[PDB]
Each structure stands twice: as structure tokens, then as C-alpha cells.
Design a protein around this ligand. Structure first.
Ligand SMILES: [Ca+2]
Length: 223
């Protein structure tokens, strides 16, 4: 997250870190046994780390649980990043409490102008590299479909939305991928892509979660 703030320990209780020896992506806990993340975060050997603030210090609220199964969206395309969504089943159910909690799925899509909370352990510089140890947060609005398509000609599908600031300076970044965009207490987006980070006229692009709720629910019901 570029241009954000320190969330506060365990204030984003659905935020997970995907670990393969090191943090490599975010995710969101959607029930005791399932995480939503970005398909472009897929790899084998994932450990889901719940209850994290400092990803380099054991602080006392962590739950570390291995993935038992990963399911990339059937229609994911890694060239275009269309359908940039994946589900991860945990080997055991997480213990849910005030600091480790699921986030509601949307029943309705969000609109341009809604404020949302974007979080992660990704890069905090736009023309530099600095990776934080504690979770970072950004409040940002959803942008119009037309401004999104104007920023990224020929690249925005019906499964993507933009959020952020066209002036630059405030955005998600590398290492935030897979993490949440939460608007009015609902998971509306997944950190997906963008040209650089926090660049003028290059807002963040997010997977549009409300398009996937039927797939998510039926996948959970059968797995
Ligand atoms: Ca920790």
C-alpha cells in the first residue's frame, strides 16, 4: 500500500497473509475454512496466516493453517487477468474470534463513489521499494466504469473495477495482490493489477467479487 496508514493490529480481522516461506500475497477469510485470493497468487505449498499484524514477529493472535486445496477460477486468463480469483480451503477450520473473523460476501455490487478499505503488506513506495512488517490500510473510492476504461484502454472487463485516485500517490502495490477491498462491510474487490503503483492516471484494478458469489457459494457447498 502506497500513501496509506498503519491499520492497527488485528483491526482488519479477515485479512490473511499467504506464506510460502515468506509473505507473497494477501487474501480474505470468508468463513472458518475458506479464503478468497487472486488467481495470479496461485502456487503450491501455501500456508495461510491468520490473525497477523507484524508478519515477522509472533505476537500472540496468529493461526497458521496449511491449504488442503486451491481452486483457480475455471475461466482465469493469466494474460488479461480476467477472472483473477481463487479459493483456498484450509486443512482445519480457523477459530473465529474478534481478531480472526470472516468478511461478508456482497449480495449486491458496489457503485462508483463508494468508499472502501484496501489493506495489505505490499510495497509502500511508488518509485522505490520498502516492504512493511505491519499491515497497511488505504481508504479509497470506487471509480466510474468510464474513468476506469479511459485509464486503461482495451483492458477493463466486466469482471474488473478501478478504485483509488487519478491524481496518484495512493494505491495498492506489489505484495498486496489477492487482498481485500471492503466497502460497507462487504468484500467487493480483490487486489489484482495496475500499471506501476500510485501513478497519475493509473488507478488500481480490482476483481469484481459480486460477479463471483454464485461460483463461490456453489464451490464451497461441494468441496
Ligand atoms: Ca505475526
Amino acid at each position: 500500500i502506497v500513501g496509506g496508514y498503519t491499520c492497527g493490529a488485528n483491526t482488519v480481522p479477515y485479512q490473511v497473509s499467504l506464506n510460502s516461506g515468506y509473505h507473497f500475497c494477501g487474501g480474505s477469510l470468508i468463513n472458518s475454512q475458506w479464503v478468497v485470493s487472486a488467481a495470479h497468487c496461485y502456487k503450491s505449498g501455501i500456508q495461510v496466516r491468520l490473525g497477523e499484524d507484524n508478519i515477522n514477529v509472533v505476537e500472540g493472535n496468529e493461526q497458521f493453517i496449511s491449504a488442503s486445496k486451491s481452486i483457480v477460477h475455471p475461466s482465469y486468463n493469466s494474460n488479461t487477468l480476467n477472472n483473477d480469483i481463487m479459493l483456498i480451503k484450509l486443512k482445519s477450520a480457523a477459530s473465529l474470534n474478534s481478531r480472526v473473523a470472516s468478511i461478508s460476501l456482497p449480495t449486491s455490487c458496489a457503485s462508483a463513489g463508494t468508499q472502501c478499505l484496501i489493506s495489505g503488506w505490499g510495497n509502500t513506495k511508488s518509485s522505490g521499494t520498502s516492504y512493511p512488517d505491519v499491515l497497511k490500510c488505504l481508504k479509497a473510492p470506487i471509480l466510474s466504469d468510464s474513468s476506469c476504461k479511459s485509464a486503461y484502454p482495451g483492458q477493463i472487463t466486466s469482471n474488473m473495477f478501478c478504485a483509488g485516485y487519478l491524481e496518484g500517490g495512493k494505491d495498492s502495490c506489489q505484495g498486496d495482490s489477492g487482498g481485500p477491498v471492503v466497502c460497507s462491510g462487504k468484500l467487493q474487490g480483490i487486489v489484482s493489477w495496475g500499471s506501476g503503483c500510485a501513478q497519475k492516471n493509473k488507478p488500481g484494478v480490482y476483481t469484481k467479487v459480486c460477479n463471483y458469489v454464485s461460483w463461490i457459494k456453489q464451490t464451497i457447498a461441494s468441496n
